[PDB]
Design a protein around this ligand. Structure first.
Ligand SMILES: [Mg+2]
Ligand SMILES: [Mg+2]
Ligand SMILES: [Mg+2]
Ligand SMILES: [Mg+2]
Ligand SMILES: [Mg+2]
Ligand SMILES: [Mg+2]
Ligand SMILES: [Mg+2]
Ligand SMILES: [Mg+2]
Ligand SMILES: [Mg+2]
Ligand SMILES: [Mg+2]
Ligand SMILES: [Mg+2]
Ligand SMILES: [Mg+2]
Ligand SMILES: [Mg+2]
Ligand SMILES: [Mg+2]
Ligand SMILES: [Mg+2]
Ligand SMILES: [Mg+2]
Ligand SMILES: [Mg+2]
Lengths: 96, 93, 107, 80, 115
RNA sequence: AAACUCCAUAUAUAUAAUUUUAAUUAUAUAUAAUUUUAUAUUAUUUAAUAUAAAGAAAGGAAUUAAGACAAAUCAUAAUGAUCCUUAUAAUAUGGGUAAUAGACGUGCUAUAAUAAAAUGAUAAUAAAAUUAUAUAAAAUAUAUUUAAUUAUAUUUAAUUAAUAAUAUAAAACAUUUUAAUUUUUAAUAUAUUUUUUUAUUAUAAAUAUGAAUUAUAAUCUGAAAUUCGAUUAUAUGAAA
């Protein structure tokens, strides 16, 4: 490095001025890497899916004419009924 | 089992010939916490001692009148009262 | 080796191998759960020269230098000139093979 | 914050009230750095199970509070 | 409180719901909500140039932020099941569950690794 | 079962304005072999050996049937029966899963000279794969009087990719050094072995192996590193 240091520094400063990028000659912790990091929140939030998705409830709202049957729900209800019948139903919940 | 130094035959001190134990003692100057010097006779060879923690700088003896150091050294730029007031919310306990 | 004795080194090594390599070995057997009756068995060329090489290596390892290559070369020169315990071992093997003459099966 | 720059690890505590009147500070922090501003304050640092009473000396100034509340019991073997 | 597990009323994710999944999802939502703020606080804290009192205050604020603001707290669950081990990011699925889906043909292209 | 299949191989055709170039390539589509032919030598028209001439022609992967082991899994998930419903359901703060007498597997690093360490910029030679929940180049600063190396910080050039980055591959090979080793050194002479020789003097079981264990200081990630994380430096230098 026969070329002088001060001149190189000046050149670097000029380049920094030209572009938006900052010029930190001292090499101090400015905190630039904290803010400059792209925020990843929306992608993280979108992990499990789109919460507004069509459900069986809606398939009654959209098409009242068609008497649909949710099979799993019906099965569950039948199981509950069977439990009630044979004395294995859920105990009544405490309120206090 | 019992650790001992086994005795030799004792030397007969004759009656009248017994001499008093005058131990070798130096006059030693003790400078206390403040500049008050006091002379005391002492068996250890040191003409001068200066003391750091004495009665003359202890609060009990005058009511009317290095981990911490390391911490101070390496948290000096921050300067760590105002700081106490800032970091002392007494709701949670 | 060549430097020590100025004549083709590879040829000399081959000769040494031929000399040293025991032509047969008294291979042990279980022998149908009985006495372990040993038999002389003829050797492949590689096996013959393999036996020789291990002995040569061992005899080299008794020499002084740090570098193994030097030690090896000294040993090869000694063998060319005609001195080793490897030769004695070969002779012993041959003697042991000679005992058990008709233990060979096909004959 | 371990690194000398950005330290120490500061936590909110009922410090000033303890300083005024000797009421021990029940910490469940265990990762708060001890400071010079609380030497001679009584702390009751959590141990997982039970809060542990400690009077912070001047030798403790650099350390964490959890370092003085040992969580596991001292191991032994039942020689059977 | 009684009507909800967490402070804020968040929606349930579609398909496979689980308690752990619910917990994670809410946490992720709160992180998304309070991402910029947290970043700003962090910046204020880790500043040699700024006033020290301000940086201390920022640090205290960061410390006092809840469990659900923390980015580090987020853990990638399986979406089809609710497992949290060997969860591949390219199809948000657990190891066994991914394999099951792959062999069926749910991940469009994935296929047997024959070489 | 074999075969079709995939990878890899050989050949052909197509495409790529040979700056996204690596055409010595990539990728679609074919063809190719579970190779063929002939002379002989043994055993009975064939089958093994050998020889020859024709060919690029030589592997790996996936596929592991029926039954069985009441083999493993109700902790991927789901469901039967059964039990809990102010609790065996739900949330927070900390602790634990990392505890340590002996024991048992798997590994890693070692115990030095057919083997370890310094160095090697017209930068000796690869492949496969990753980079919008990023990859981070050059360069400056400190550790460190030059600088390089290694490690951090400073700050983001380029590219979301046959285009840029991760990334000058490493052993190799070459010079140098290497205690145990008076199998070396350094003072004299010595000389047609001179990075060396000879003579005479003095040079008197763990190292210039190993890297466990610990002390202090820094750095990294994170809101947080005490229990309980990862680096770097200066010391520490067990066992073997
Ligand atoms: Mg098959
Ligand atoms: Mg080309
Ligand atoms: Mg089967
Ligand atoms: Mg069973
Ligand atoms: Mg079974
Ligand atoms: Mg079940
Ligand atoms: Mg379940
Ligand atoms: Mg519960
Ligand atoms: Mg475990
Ligand atoms: Mg295993
Ligand atoms: Mg070594
Ligand atoms: Mg660079
Ligand atoms: Mg490139
Ligand atoms: Mg290189
Ligand atoms: Mg030893
Ligand atoms: Mg070492
Ligand atoms: Mg080493």
């Amino acid at each position: 490095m026969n070329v002088p240091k001060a001149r190189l520094l000046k050149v670097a400063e000029l380049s920094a001025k030209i572009f938006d990028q900052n010029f930190n000659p001292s090499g101090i912790r400015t905190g630039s890497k904290i803010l400059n990091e792209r925020l990843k929140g929306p992608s993280v939030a979108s992990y499990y899916g789109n919460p507004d998705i069509l459900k069986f409830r809606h398939l009654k709202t959209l098409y009242p004419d068609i008497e649909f049957v949710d099979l799993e729900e019906q099965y569950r209800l039948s199981m509950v009924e069977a439990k009630k019948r044979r004395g294995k139903g859920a105990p009544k919940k405490m309120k206090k | 089992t019992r650790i001992t130094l086994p005795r030799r035959p004792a030397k007969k001190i004759q009656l009248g010939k017994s001499r008093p134990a005058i131990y070798h003692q130096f006059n030693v100057k003790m400078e206390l916490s403040d500049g008050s010097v006091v002379i005391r006779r002492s068996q250890y060879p040191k003409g001068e001692i200066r003391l750091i923690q004495d009665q003359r700088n202890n609060p009990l003896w005058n009511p009317s009148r290095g981990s911490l150091d390391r911490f101070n050294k390496r948290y000096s730029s921050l300067f760590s009262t105002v700081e106490l007031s800032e970091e002392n919310k007494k709701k949670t306990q | 080796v060549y430097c020590q004795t100025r004549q083709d080194p590879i040829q000399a090594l081959e000769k040494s191998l031929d000399e040293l390599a025991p032509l047969m070995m008294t291979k042990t057997f279980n022998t149908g759960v009985a006495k372990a009756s040993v038999i002389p068995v003829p050797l492949n060329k590689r096996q013959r020269n393999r036996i020789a090489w291990n002995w040569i290596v061992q005899s080299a390892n008794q020499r002084v230098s740090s570098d193994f290559a030097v030690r090896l070369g000294e040993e090869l020169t000694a063998i060319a000139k005609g001195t080793s315990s490897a030769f004695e071992k070969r002779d012993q093997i041959h003697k042991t093979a000679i005992a058990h003459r008709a233990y060979i099966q096909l004959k | 914050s371990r690194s000398v720059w950005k330290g120490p690890n500061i936590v909110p505590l009922p410090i000033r009230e303890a300083m005024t009147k000797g009421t021990p500070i029940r910490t469940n922090a265990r990762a708060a750095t001890i400071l010079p501003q609380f030497v001679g304050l009584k702390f009751q640092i959590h141990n997982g199970k039970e809060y542990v009473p400690i009077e912070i000396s001047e030798d403790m100034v650099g350390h964490k509070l959890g370092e003085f509340a040992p969580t596991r019991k001292r191991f032994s073997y039942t020689q059977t | 409180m009684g009507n909800f597990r967490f402070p804020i009323k968040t929606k349930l994710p579609p398909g496979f719901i689980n308690a752990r999944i619910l917990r994670d999802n809410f946490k992720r939502q709160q992180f998304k909500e309070n991402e910029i703020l947290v970043k700003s606080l962090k910046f204020i804290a880790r500043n040699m140039n700024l006033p020290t009192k301000l940086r201390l205050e920022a640090q205290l604020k960061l410390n006092a932020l809840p469990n659900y603001m923390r980015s580090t707290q987020i853990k990638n669950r399986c979406v089809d099941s609710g497992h949290a081990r060997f969860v591949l990011s390219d199809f948000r699925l657990c190891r066994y569950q991914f394999r099951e889906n792959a062999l069926k043909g749910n991940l469009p292209g994935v296929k047997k690794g024959i070489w």
